[PDB]
Amino acid sequence: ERLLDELTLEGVARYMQSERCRRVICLVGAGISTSAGIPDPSTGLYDNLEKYHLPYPEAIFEISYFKKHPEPFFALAKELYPGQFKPTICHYFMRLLKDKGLLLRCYTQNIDTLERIAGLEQEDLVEAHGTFYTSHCVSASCRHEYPLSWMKEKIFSEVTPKCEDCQSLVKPDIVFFGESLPARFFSCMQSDFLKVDLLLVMGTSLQVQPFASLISKAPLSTPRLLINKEKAGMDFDSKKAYRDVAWLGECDQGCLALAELLGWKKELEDLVRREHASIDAQ
Ligand SMILES: [Zn+2]
């Protein structure tokens, strides 16, 4: 019955080498980007906003307030926006899955675009909270699109981004409070998990819905691995535990350990130093 030899990282790895493990879905959150300097989340973000004199601290990420007073959001973005965008070991572990024909999807809660920087393409990605990768004019008759290079220079230069056709405000394609999740999230979830062979859940405690409910959409036999600072969301320990495995610690170290067990570690670390060097050159 059990598709896993044993509820360990080793059994996951062995399963990953069986003929039956063809289709892998990654579900990732803020914990896969912390080691890249991206924040988030009781990290204190809403605790430092007095200088923006907001009606309430969360207004800085609320769509209706943003459309009226975009300047706090874009000043906050400049302040928090990292000096470089270098994907983590964990990001490049997921690119190996893509490169070996194992990645069905990466569903991500993150907006930092590191999955794309690491080499995942749009077909590979479900950006459940949207992304800074692209931005759009907020006027419904226009919706002119702007790339990250454009939005980045506007934020760094402290120039409120305005549309070059109609002068309306231009917003990054991230999901603000008051906005709905992208259609791509709900459409892809309808069938992606009907026949997935493994769920890899990394850097999320599965406290956020409807993203957390994705893990219950897989077949009951599909093994599920959690790489996270804390156990949550799965049956690791009861008398009925049969398919869920928890590795507790930082996402990067967990991916390195999984890589070693598959014989992927050399290939992975060689991808990291290489890609990080290209980024420093730019
Ligand atoms: Zn416009």
Swiss-Prot record:
Record text on activity regulation: Inhibited by Sirtinol, A3 and M15 small molecules. Inhibited by nicotinamide. Inhibited by a macrocyclic peptide inhibitor S2iL5. Inhibited by EP300-induced acetylation.
Q: Looking at the keywords, is Zinc present?
A: yes
GO BP annotations of the record are: autophagy; cell division; cellular response to caloric restriction; cellular response to epinephrine stimulus; cellular response to hypoxia; cellular response to oxidative stress; epigenetic regulation of gene expression; heterochromatin formation
Q: In which tissues is it expressed?
A: Isoform 1 is expressed in heart, liver and skeletal muscle, weakly expressed in the cortex. Isoform 2 is strongly expressed in the cortex, weakly expressed in heart and liver. Weakly expressed in several malignancies including breast, liver, brain, kidney and prostate cancers compared to normal tissues. Weakly expressed in glioma cell lines compared to normal brain tissues (at protein level). Widely expressed. Highly expressed in heart, brain and skeletal muscle, while it is weakly expressed in placenta and lung.
An example GO CC term for this entry is: centrosome
* Localization per record: Nucleus; Cytoplasm, Perinuclear region; Cytoplasm; Cytoplasm, Cytoskeleton
Q: Which residues form the active site?
A: H129 (proton acceptor)
Induction remark = Up-regulated in response to low levels of glucose and anoxia-reoxygenation stress. Up-regulated by trichostatin A. Down-regulated in response to high levels of glucose. Down-regulated by histone deacetylation in several tumors.
Indicate which residues the UniProt annotation says bind NAD(+). 30-34, 109-112, 204-205, 228-230, 251
Its keywords, alphabetically, are:
Acetylation, Autophagy, Cell cycle, Cell division, Cell membrane, Cell projection, Chromosome, Cytoplasm, Cytoskeleton, Differentiation, Immunity, Innate immunity, Meiosis, Membrane, Metal-binding, Microtubule, Mitosis, NAD, Neurodegeneration, Neurogenesis, Nucleus, Phosphoprotein, Transcription, Transcription regulation, Transferase, Ubl conjugation, Zinc
Outcome (variant: S238A): Reduces deacetylase activity
Source organism's superkingdom? Eukaryota
| Record family assignment | Belongs to the sirtuin family. Class I subfamily.
Q: How does it assemble?
A: Interacts with CDC20, FOXO3 and FZR1. Associates with microtubules in primary cortical mature neurons. Homotrimer. Isoform 1 and isoform 2 interact (via both phosphorylated, unphosphorylated, active or inactive forms) with HDAC6; the interaction is necessary for the complex to interact with alpha-tubulin, suggesting that these proteins belong to a large complex that deacetylates the cytoskeleton. Interacts with FOXO1; the interaction is disrupted upon serum-starvation or oxidative stress, leading to increased level of acetylated FOXO1 and induction of autophagy.
Its biological purpose: NAD-dependent protein deacetylase, which deacetylates internal lysines on histone and alpha-tubulin as well as many other proteins such as key transcription factors. Participates in the modulation of multiple and diverse biological processes such as cell cycle control, genomic integrity, microtubule dynamics, cell differentiation, metabolic networks, and autophagy. Plays a major role in the control of cell cycle progression and genomic stability.
The name this protein carries in UniProt is: NAD-dependent protein deacetylase sirtuin-2
Q: What organism does the UniProt record list as the source?
A: Homo sapiens
Entire protein: shown range:
56 to 355 of 389
